[PDB]
Amino acid sequence: VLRSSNEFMRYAVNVALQKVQQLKETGHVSGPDGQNPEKIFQNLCDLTRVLLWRYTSIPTSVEESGKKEKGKSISLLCLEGLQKIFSAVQQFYQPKIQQFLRALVSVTQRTAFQIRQFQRSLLNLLSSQEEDFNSKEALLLVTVLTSLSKLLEPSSPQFVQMLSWTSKICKENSREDALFCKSLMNLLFSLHVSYKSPVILLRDLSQDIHGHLGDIDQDVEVEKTNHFAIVNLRTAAPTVCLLVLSQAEKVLEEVDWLITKLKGQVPNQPVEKAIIMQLGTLLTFFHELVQTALPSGSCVDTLLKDLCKMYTTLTALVRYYLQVCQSSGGIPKNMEKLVKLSGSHLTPLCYSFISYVQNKSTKPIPNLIFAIEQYEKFLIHLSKKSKVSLMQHMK
Amino acid sequence: GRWDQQYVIQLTSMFKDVPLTAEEVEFVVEKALSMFSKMNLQEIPPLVYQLLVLSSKGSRKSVLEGIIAFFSALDKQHNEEQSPSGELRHVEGTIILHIVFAIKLDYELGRELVKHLKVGQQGDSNNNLSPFSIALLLSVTRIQRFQDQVLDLLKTSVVKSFKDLQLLQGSKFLQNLVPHRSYVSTMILEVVKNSVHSWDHVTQGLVELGFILMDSYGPKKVLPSLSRMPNQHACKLGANILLETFKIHEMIRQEILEQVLNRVVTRASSPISHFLDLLSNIVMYAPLVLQSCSSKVTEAFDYLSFLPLQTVQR
Amino acid sequence: VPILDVLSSLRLDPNFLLKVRQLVMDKLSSIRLEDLPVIIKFILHSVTAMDTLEVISELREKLDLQHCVSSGQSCIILLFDVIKSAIRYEKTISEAWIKAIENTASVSEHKVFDLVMLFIIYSTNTQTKKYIDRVLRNKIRSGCIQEQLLQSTFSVHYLVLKDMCSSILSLAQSLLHSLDQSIISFGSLLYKYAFKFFDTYCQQEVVGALVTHICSG
């Protein structure tokens, strides 16, 4: 009599939604014995088990309810509840996640099995090839999978398997919805960053972006789309450039702190070598990015501020070299190649991009020309105090 | 030339009354400094006493810098042994006592001490600081001039500690390069562990320090990790400090207590959940002590008619 | 006291409370020893943001503490405690109180109470410490504060001060660093009585502060 009802069933899970939302807002909820965490925890376990059996036993593809009930599917509401539960239990009951999952060996294998289940659920969502594209479901899936990736160690093998699967998904699936792409790239970065430096992935993204967008001169025919499938003229142009820019920004902050600590120091040699390897790769990324014909919204001024940051890092670099070149004497050949590529590829195309943003028709371009001329000034000083000419490379 | 083990006391006692110059006193203290590695430990206190009364001439910086590096390596070696603890503590205390009298008599000594130590030359962590270093600073803050200066310094240094630490854990690439360094927090905690014995001069500043952290960075916004983690870890550290302190010190209770109560009761607007959870942990661990620390709560109930309800429930 | 509890309990207008407050303030020397504290407790609960100054003035005028003589000790103590709690669990009491003894300028007939409360406030909340120093220097140079004052102060109410001796020294430190011999003499007497009545640790801190003064000063 109740299983025939659908309004009743969606109502009960909406009540459970109010329970979990109460808890996520507070440290507890309203109902009786809604103050002792233990009973709450147990109830959470059982609720989660019920919703798991629902969404597993019964797939998504059972809504014969109505075209309005596709976004009110019990298969969808149970997923959203699962998501909130995992968020809240990570928040509060971090010291019991193992025993929490044990009702469903380290946390690693438990997480791995649940990840198989969930990512396969998303896998059959995708291989549905559903043109309606329940992006709500897809976004809940990537959201909860992101919530769950945090419990695997960045050295655990299933962490690496997850990174593999994520890159694989980004390489096959395109799925034109910018928000799905955004959350999925955020998750893949949360993985790739925690496993190594992302600069390889950053450079591949800039290559796809240059490919899809084209160029500022509109006679540079490029399509490096093979690198990743999730790159779209609607998504990649406005959105993903901004995310990868924020990523490069964070790396620039890290290396700035590194320059600061090495300055304060005077351990030294392999540190500077790793730093300049990172910076050469970021320069390749910058070159892939700047030739692109971006939209004239915030994408262009974010690129200009990021290039200002690049010149600022180069200024601090030549500053620390001006600090050190008295004690040891000379310059590393790697730094010589670095400033060479800077003067050769970046600055002329930098001014070309300044010209391309300025011809078409306030604060950043003044800041960028200030940055590059300060870089040139400190390059004059370093060429003087390094016993080597550094403007012969320059034009 | 080489000196006797027994006769370094008198060697430096002679240079006590000589008219000397910079390099004269410099070589004197450098010889007496390098002599430390061939010494019983009951011998070091009056040695350092005389080293400093001679440091009074001009030679201030190097005495402290050497004592610092000495005791730094010493405590590292002792922690690696753990991988005469009571005696080692008893030393460090009387060293710091005599360094206190010194900066009491010299209002410049502490400035160079500070200048030697301040991590915020630009902001990057120096490797100069240590448990013993910090213990000296906190035994110093009870002098009226340097107090606030020191307590600001320590605060900002802890802040940088946590900033660099959260960036580290946030980034694999940097985690690959740098070896973990004994953080300021953990430094302080171990200091508290050592404080058990006879370190009365330190606790008076520890109390203030913890409460200062809590008052400075307590939740106030809701009346984000970059903004909140430092602030939360800061108050959390203050909490841990006061907790592990209140566990063992029997003469700063009632005043830890009444301070929490004072900051709690009256304000009645800004969040004090941190104070309350702290208080909860405190009471839970060791209530029987509070049968001795009684009347503050009996009188605290008197405001209960004026207080707001939810807070009263907690 | 019962009356007062009941009046706290009942549904009233406050204009009546004020009348009653004035009434008790008149009937304030004319109370037995024991309850006194709780009466004052009532008053200081009852006070507000604005009336505060005047009531305190009246209070500061009506409290004597040479009059209260196991003949006054326990109760005085408890009183001070109460006050201590009051000015702990609110601030503006102290700024007003200071104002009141500060603007008591024409009065060369200053009573014991004032210093005692100054010590106390110095011991407690510290933002105003420089205010306290400033004002105390100013009344000293004015000669309104003198030394038989301090004599009878430490000859009776010391027991209150034992547990804030550290305040006295932190003050005397800032007293001897100034000019104007009378100030310096005051700080001396401070150090003297502190070493005199209190315990070993105090004595020790005395000697240790004087030596500092000598060597450095």
Give the separation between CA B168 and CA B162, rounded to whole angstroms.
10
For the record, the structure tokens of A229 come out as 């499938």
For the record, the structure tokens of A193 come out as 């960053």
Full DSSP string of A18-62: HHHHHHHHSSS-SSTT-S-HHHHHHHHHHHHHHHHHHHHHS-STT
The resolution in angstroms reads 4.4
Task: Tell me whether A266 touches chain B (CB under 8 Å).
Answer: no
Give the separation between CA C172 and CA C195, rounded to whole angstroms.
13
- Chain-centroid distance of CA A13 in Å reads 32
For residue B299, give how far its alpha carbon lies from the nearest alpha carbon of chain C (Å).
Answer: 8
| Alpha-carbon distances, residue B51 vs B72, B73, B91, B113, B117 (angstroms) | 19, 20, 16, 16, 20
Query: How large is the C-alpha radius of gyration of chain A?
Result: 26
Side-chain-side CA neighbours of residue B271 (13 Å): 14
CB A388 within 8 Å of CB A331: yes
Query: Which residue in B has a C-alpha nearest to residue A265's C-alpha?
Result: B126
Name the residue type at position B120.
G
- Please indicate whether, in this complex, the C-beta atoms of A193 and B125 are within 8 angstroms of each other: no
Residue A275 CB partners (closer than 8 Å, separation 6+): A255, A258, A259
- B265 vs C contacts (CB less than 8 Å): 89
Neighbors of chain C with 3 or more C-beta pairs under 8 Å: B
Give the separation between CA C176 and CA C210, rounded to whole angstroms.
10
Residue C199 CB partners (closer than 8 Å, separation 6+): C162
Give the separation between CA A347 and CA A311, rounded to whole angstroms.
10
CB A180 within 8 Å of CB A170: no
For the record, the structure tokens of A249 come out as 């920004």
CB B240 within 8 Å of CB B201: no
For the record, the structure tokens of A1 come out as 């009599």
Question: How many Cβ atoms sit within 10 Å of the Cβ of residue A234?
Answer: 11
3-class DSSP state of B20? coil
| Alpha-carbon distances, residue A388 vs A59, A374, B114 (angstroms) | 70, 19, 40
For the record, the structure tokens of A76 come out as 């969808």
For residue A196, give how far its alpha carbon lies from the nearest alpha carbon of chain B (Å).
Answer: 5
Give the separation between CA A364 and CA A356, rounded to whole angstroms.
14
CB C68 within 8 Å of CB C76: yes
Give the separation between CA A204 and CA A224, rounded to whole angstroms.
8
- C216 vs B contacts (CB less than 8 Å): 104-107
CB B147 within 8 Å of CB B96: no
**After which residues does chain A break, using C–N > 2.5 Å?**
104, 266, 361
DSSP class of residue A395? -
- Please indicate whether, in this complex, the C-beta atoms of C216 and B144 are within 8 angstroms of each other: no
Residue C132 CB partners (closer than 8 Å, separation 6+): C98, C118, C121, C122
Cα dihedral across residues A75, A81, A87, A93: positive or negative: negative
For the record, the structure tokens of C212 come out as 């500092």
Give the separation between CA A344 and CA A287, rounded to whole angstroms.
11
Neighbors of chain B with 3 or more C-beta pairs under 8 Å: A, C
Closest CA to C84 of A153, A296, B254: B254
CB A17 within 8 Å of CB A80: yes
- Please indicate whether, in this complex, the C-beta atoms of B104 and C212 are within 8 angstroms of each other: yes
- Please indicate whether, in this complex, the C-beta atoms of B299 and C85 are within 8 angstroms of each other: yes
